[PDB]
Design a binder for this molecule. Structure first.
Ligand SMILES: [Mg+2]
Lengths: 49, 130, 119, 111, 143, 246
RNA sequence: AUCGCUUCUCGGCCUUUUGGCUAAGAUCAAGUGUAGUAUCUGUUCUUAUCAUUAAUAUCGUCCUCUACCGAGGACAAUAUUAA
RNA sequence: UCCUUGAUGAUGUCAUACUUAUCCUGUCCCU
C-alpha cells in the first residue's frame, strides 16, 4: 500500500530538477504499440499491378 | 555458552516496533529481591491485588526509584534518537539536484521508480541510443 | 551558460524573495534596537516604549490559551518542578535553540569528504 | 455563508471533488496503514486529469490498484462534468443566448 | 552612519549627500573609525565583523580585509589601529580585546581582560608601548 | 585573437547542475551569535519563539508535529506548565493520536513528575484502551518505580479487556521475573480459558515442563486433549504430548 | 564463544518531500541612452612579534569609629647591594 | 587564587565595461 511520488509533466511547484529517465517515465506512450494492419498490402499491390 | 540472533523485518506497524522495543527493555531490567520481599512482608494480603483492590492513589516512590526511572528513560530516548542512521555523503556521484530538498526528493524517486527506469538510464549514459 | 546556471539555481517567486530580505532587515533592526536598549540599561536611563496591537503581549504575561491538566486518582498538588538555571554570563541565542540540522550535517559531510579524500 | 454563484462554480467543484477523494482514501486504506499519503494521491488525481485533457495515456508503474481504480473513477466523473458543460455552453453560444466572453473562449478551448 | 543601515557621505556645510552606501546584507555600523593614514575606515557592524571601507575617493568596501574572531551581538564599540597601521584592536561585549594583524588579516592576539563588557579601546598615538581600554565595569585599563 | 578549434573538455549538463548547486542563491547565512544578558532579552527571545509557534498553530490548526515542536521547546527551558497547556490543547484537537499521549507522558516522566505522568497514563488507558502501547509503558513505569502491586493492578485492569497473546505473555513474564510460579499458573489458567488454541496449551504445558511440574503438565495434557475433542486437532498437540511422555 | 570501545560496509524508516482550480490560465525578443557601480588589473613595498637579581623596612582612593580633622585596615610600586 | 586551537604577494586605486523612476520601435557588408 505504498504510494509513489507524483512526478508531473506540467507542474513543478518548488522548482526541482528531476533526472530525465524519471521525467520521461510515461510508460503508456511507450507501450502504445502502433501496430499496422495487413490490408495495406492488398491495396498497395493492387495499385501497382 | 549461549547464542541468540535477533534481526528485524520491515516496519508493518507502530505496535510491532513498540513490542520489539518493550521486549528489549524488559529483558534488560533486573529486579532487586530485597525491596520486593520487604514490600511483600509489609503489605501482606493486598500485595496480590485485583482490579478493584484499594491501592490506587497511595504509592510514593523514594528518590532512588525515580532516579532509576529517569536514567532508564534517558537511555531509551537516546536509543530512539539513533533511529535513522545518516548515510555518508560521497560527492563523486554526478549530482542531479539544485537544492537540499531536491536531493531527498530524487532519492525517494530513485527508491520508487528506480526499478522501472533502468533502460532509459542506460540510454542516457550510452548516448541516448537503443 | 551563466544565465543557464542562474536560472537552474532559482526556485523562488518575487514574494518569497522580498520576504527573505524583510526577515534579514527585521534581524538587523532587532540588533540595532537591542544595542540601544542595552546601552540605556547599562548607563541607566529608563526610557519606555509604546506597543499598539490587540494580541501578542499575551504570551509572556501568562499562559496563552491555558488548559489545566485534567486531574484525578493521584494527589498532584505537592510536587513541582525545578526551573532552568539562567547562567547569563555564557548563554547565547544559539545555545537555547540548539544546533540547526544543516550545520551538523555540514560538519558531517566535511568529515566524510576529508576521510574519503585522504584515503 | 457565501453562496456559490457563477464565479465560484468551478473552484467549488474542485474543492468538493478533492474532499470526496479524501474521504474515500481514508476509508479505503486497511487497518494498519500509516495514515499519511493523502497529498500524494491527490497529486496523482491532478496528473490523471491533465493526462485526460492531454489525451496522454496515464499509467503510474507501481501504484496500488484500488488507488488507480478510484482515481480513474473520479477522473471519469470530472470528464463527464467538463464535457456536459461544454455541450450546454455550445448550445447557448449557437442559439444566441447570453454568454460571457470568457465562457466563449473557454468553450472554444474545450471544443 | 545611522540606525537604518546606511552611510551618508557629504561635503561640508552642504546638505545633500553625494554617496550613499547600503547593501541588504550589512546589519549595522554602530562605531566607525578612521586610519591615521586617512586611507581606511573600520566599522564594527552588529553582524559580528569589521568592515574596511576605502577612505580614498572610491568608498567601496574591500573583500581582502575582514575581521571575524570576536562577537558583538549588538554593542557599540571602538575599533582602533596601532599607529603605523600594523594592528587593529576591537573591544567587545565578552570583554576580550581582539588584536588582528592588518597586513596578514588574522587574529594575532586576544585578551580576556575585564570581567564585564568592554567598549572603547585606544592605542596611544605616540607610544607603541600601550593601549587604553574602558568598559562597563567602570575601570580604565592600560595594556 | 580568437581561435575556433575543436575542444577536449566538452561541458555536459551534470556539470551545469553541479555549478548551479554551488551558487547557493537561496541559502541564507545563519543568524549571528547573539549573546543574551539578563532576563529582559531572554523574555524577548521567548516572545519571538512563542509568537512563531502560535502562528504555526494558527494556520495548520491540526498537523500534530507543530504542537510537539512547541512543547519540546517549552520543556527544554523547564517551563513545563506551558507545555502541559500545549499538550492539553493538542489533545483537545486530536485525542486519538497516540504518539501525542506518549510525548506528554514521557515529558512528565522525564521531568520527575511521577504523579502527573501516572494521571496521564490512567487517562490514556481509559480513553484509548485498545492501544497496547499505553498499557505496556504504564506497567513498565510502575515496575521501574518499584510499585510492584501497582503494576499488578494495572495488569489486572488490562486483562479485563481480553487483549491478545502477547499481553498475557508479558504479564506472565512479569510474574516469573519476580517469583510466583503459582500466580503465573493462575494467569496461565485464565489465558487458556480466554484464548483456546492448541499453541497456547502447548506453551502452558512447556511452562509446566520447564519448571518441573510433570504431574501438573500431564494434568494439563489430559485436560487439553479432552477439551479439543476428536475431530478437529492438528498434529502439534499430540506431537508435544508424545515428546513429553518420550 | 561472550562483553565494551573505535574504523569501515550495508539494509530498513527515509509521502520528513513537490500543499488547489481554468482557456498548458494567457503571452513570448531588443536597442537607446547615461552615469554610476562593480570588477579586474597591475603598481608598490612582507616575514616577524619589543623591550637584572637577592635581603630588610614603610601621595591618591574605599570602608569603619570618635569629635573638615585624627586613628586603624586593604589596594596601587619604591629604596639598597651585587654581574 | 585564570584563561582555551591554523588554510600559499597584498592592498589600494584607477580605469573600463556593463546595465536607467525611463524611455523611443528597427538594418548592415562583399561574387
Ligand atoms: Mg514569475
Amino acid at each position: 500500500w505504498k504510494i509513489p511520488p507524483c512526478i508531473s509533466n506540467w507542474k513543478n511547484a518548488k522548482g526541482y530538477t528531476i533526472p530525465l529517465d524519471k521525467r520521461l517515465a510515461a510508460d503508456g506512450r511507450g507501450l502504445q504499440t502502433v501496430h499496422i494492419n495487413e490490408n495495406f498490402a492488398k491495396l498497395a499491390e493492387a495499385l501497382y499491378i | 555458552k549461549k547464542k541468540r540472533k535477533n534481526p528485524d523485518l520491515g516496519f508493518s506497524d507502530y505496535a510491532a516496533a513498540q513490542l520489539r522495543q518493550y521486549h528489549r527493555l524488559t529483558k534488560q531490567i533486573k529486579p532487586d529481591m530485597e525491596t520486593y520481599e520487604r514490600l511483600r512482608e509489609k503489605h501482606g494480603e493486598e500485595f496480590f491485588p485485583t482490579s478493584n483492590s484499594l491501592l490506587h492513589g497511595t504509592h510514593v516512590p523514594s528518590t532512588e526509584e525515580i532516579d532509576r526511572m529517569v536514567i532508564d528513560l534517558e537511555k531509551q530516548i537516546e536509543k530512539r534518537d539513533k533511529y535513522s542512521r545518516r548515510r555518508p555523503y560521497n560527492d563523486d556521484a554526478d549530482i542531479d539536484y539544485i537544492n537540499e530538498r531536491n536531493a531527498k526528493f530524487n532519492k525517494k524517486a530513485e527508491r520508487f521508480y528506480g526499478k522501472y527506469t533502468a533502460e532509459i538510464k542506460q540510454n542516457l549514459e550510452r548516448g541516448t541510443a537503443v | 551558460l551563466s544565465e543557464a546556471r542562474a536560472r537552474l539555481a532559482n526556485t523562488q517567486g518575487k514574494k518569497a524573495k522580498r520576504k527573505a530580505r524583510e526577515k534579514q532587515l527585521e534581524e538587523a533592526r532587532r540588533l540595532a534596537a537591542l544595542q540601544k536598549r542595552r546601552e540605556l540599561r547599562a548607563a541607566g536611563i529608563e526610557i519606555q516604549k509604546k506597543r499598539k496591537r490587540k494580541r501578542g503581549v499575551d504570551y509572556n504575561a501568562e499562559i496563552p490559551f491555558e488548559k489545566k491538566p485534567a486531574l484525578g486518582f493521584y494527589d498532584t498538588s505537592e510536587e513541582n518542578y525545578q526551573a532552568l538555571d539562567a547562567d547569563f554570563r555564557k548563554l547565547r541565542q544559539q545555545d537555547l535553540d540548539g544546533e540547526l540540522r544543516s550545520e551538523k550535517e555540514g560538519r558531517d559531510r566535511k568529515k566524510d569528504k576529508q576521510h574519503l579524500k585522504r584515503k | 455563508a457565501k453562496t456559490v454563484t457563477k464565479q465560484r462554480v468551478e473552484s467549488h467543484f474542485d474543492l468538493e471533488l478533492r474532499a470526496a477523494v479524501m474521504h474515500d482514501i481514508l476509508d479505503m486504506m486497511p487497518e494498519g496503514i500509516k495514515q499519511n499519503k493523502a497529498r500524494t494521491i491527490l497529486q496523482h488525481l491532478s496528473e490523471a486529469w491533465r493526462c485526460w485533457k492531454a489525451n496522454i495515456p496515464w499509467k503510474v508503474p507501481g501504484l496500488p490498484t484500488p488507488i488507480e481504480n478510484m482515481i480513474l473513477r473520479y477522473v471519469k466523473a470530472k470528464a463527464d462534468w467538463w464535457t456536459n458543460t461544454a455541450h450546454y455552453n455550445r448550445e447557448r453560444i449557437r442559439r444566441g443566448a447570453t454568454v460571457d466572453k470568457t465562457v466563449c473562449k473557454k468553450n472554444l478551448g474545450r471544443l | 552612519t545611522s540606525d537604518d543601515k546606511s552611510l551618508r557621505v557629504w561635503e561640508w556645510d552642504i546638505p545633500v549627500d553625494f554617496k550613499y552606501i547600503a547593501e541588504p546584507s550589512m546589519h549595522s555600523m554602530p562605531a566607525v573609525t578612521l586610519s591615521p593614514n586617512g586611507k581606511w575606515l573600520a566599522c564594527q557592524s552588529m553582524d559580528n565583523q569589521i568592515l574596511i571601507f576605502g577612505a580614498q575617493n572610491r568608498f567601496r568596501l574591500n573583500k581582502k580585509k575582514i575581521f571575524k574572531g570576536h562577537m558583538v551581538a549588538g554593542y557599540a564599540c571602538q575599533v582602533d589601529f596601532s599607529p603605523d597601521m600594523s594592528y587593529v584592536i576591537s573591544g567587545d561585549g565578552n570583554g576580550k580585546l581582539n588584536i588582528w594583524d592588518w597586513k596578514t588579516t588574522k587574529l594575532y592576539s586576544r585578551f580576556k581582560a575585564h570581567d564585564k563588557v568592554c567598549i572603547g579601546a585606544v592605542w596611544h598615538p605616540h607610544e607603541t608601548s600601550k593601549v587604553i581600554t574602558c568598559g562597563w565595569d567602570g575601570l580604565i585599563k592600560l595594556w | 585573437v580568437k581561435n575556433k578549434a575543436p575542444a577536449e573538455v566538452q561541458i555536459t549538463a551534470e556539470q551545469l547542475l553541479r555549478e548551479a548547486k554551488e551558487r547557493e542563491l537561496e541559502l541564507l547565512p545563519p543568524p549571528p551569535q547573539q549573546k543574551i544578558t539578563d532576563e529582559e532579552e531572554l523574555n524577548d527571545y521567548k516572545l519571538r519563539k512563542r509568537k512563531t509557534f502560535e502562528d504555526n498553530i494558527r494556520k495548520n490548526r491540526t498537523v500534530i508535529s507543530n504542537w510537539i515542536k512547541y512543547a519540546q521547546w517549552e520543556e527544554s527551558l523547564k517551563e513545563i506548565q506551558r507545555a502541559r497547556s500545549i499538550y492539553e490543547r493538542a489533545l483537545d484537537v486530536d485525542y486519538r493520536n497516540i504518539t501525542l499521549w506518549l510525548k506528554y507522558a514521557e515529558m512528565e516522566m522525564k521531568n520527575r513528575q511521577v504523579n502527573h505522568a501516572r494521571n496521564i497514563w490512567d487517562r490514556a488507558i481509559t480513553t484509548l484502551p485498545r492501544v497496547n502501547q499505553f498499557w505496556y509503558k504504564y506497567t513498565y513505569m510502575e515496575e521501574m518505580l518499584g510499585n510492584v502491586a501497582g503494576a499488578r493492578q494495572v495488569f489486572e485492569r488490562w486483562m479485563e479487556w481480553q487483549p491478545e497473546e502477547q499481553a498475557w505473555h508479558s504479564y506472565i513474564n512479569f510474574e516469573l521475573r519476580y517469583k510466583e510460579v503459582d500466580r503465573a499458573r493462575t494467569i496461565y489458567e485464565r489465558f487458556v480459558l480466554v484464548h483456546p488454541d492448541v499453541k497456547n496449551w502447548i506453551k502452558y504445558a512447556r511452562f509446566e515442563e520447564k519448571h518441573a511440574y510433570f504431574a501438573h503438565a500431564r494434568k494439563v495434557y489430559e485436560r487439553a486433549v479432552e477439551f479439543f475433542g476428536d475431530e478437529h486437532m492438528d498434529e502439534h498437540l499430540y506431537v508435544a504430548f508424545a515428546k513429553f511422555e518420550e
